[PDB]
């Protein structure tokens, strides 16, 4: 359903923009260790791909049918109109 998906993507966008903030500042986590002696390593975030994901999300939110505009699956090439 359109607006349920739009809210999904709004929450995901919140998380992604916070991640982008922390990433450019150098606060994006790549390793965590607890005093429990248990460890977690993460695949490093990439600024380009994360910005692009943010743009997908914002565009879907802007669109009438977010769940379709996110994937962009039925793409078609841009034609040109000449004067």
């Amino acid at each position: 359903t359109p607006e349920e998906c739009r809210a999904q993507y709004r929450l995901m966008l919140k998380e992604a923009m916070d991640a982008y903030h922390q990433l450019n500042l150098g606060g994006s986590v790549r390793v965590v260790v607890d005093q429990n002696s248990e460890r977690v390593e993460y695949t490093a975030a990439n600024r380009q791909s994360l910005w692009a994901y943010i743009v997908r999300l914002q565009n879907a939110i802007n669109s009438d049918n977010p769940c379709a505009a996110f994937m962009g699956l039925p793409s078609s090439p841009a034609g040109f109109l000449f004067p």
């Binding site: 606060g27 986590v29 965590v32 607890d34 429990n36 248990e38 977690v40």
Partner: peptide, 15 residues
Amino acid sequence: SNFAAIKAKARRDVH
């Protein structure tokens, strides 16, 4: 800091 959430997510992924 946000470490309380980092720790939580870490433990959640470990599990």
